[PDB]
Amino acid sequence: XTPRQARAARAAXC
Numbered sequence: 456x457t458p459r460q461a462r463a464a465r466a467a468x469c
């Protein structure tokens with residue numbers, strides 16, 4: 456994946 460999940464993952468490095 457969702458818009459949040461994708462950004463959250465990006466912010467973490469996943």
Ligand SMILES: *Cc1cccc(-c2cccc(C*)c2)c1
Nearest residue numbers: 456457460461463464467469
């Ligand atoms: C595509 C996806 C599915 C589940 C969880 C995540 C995710 C979200 C935040 C951080 C990380 C490392 C992974 C992504």
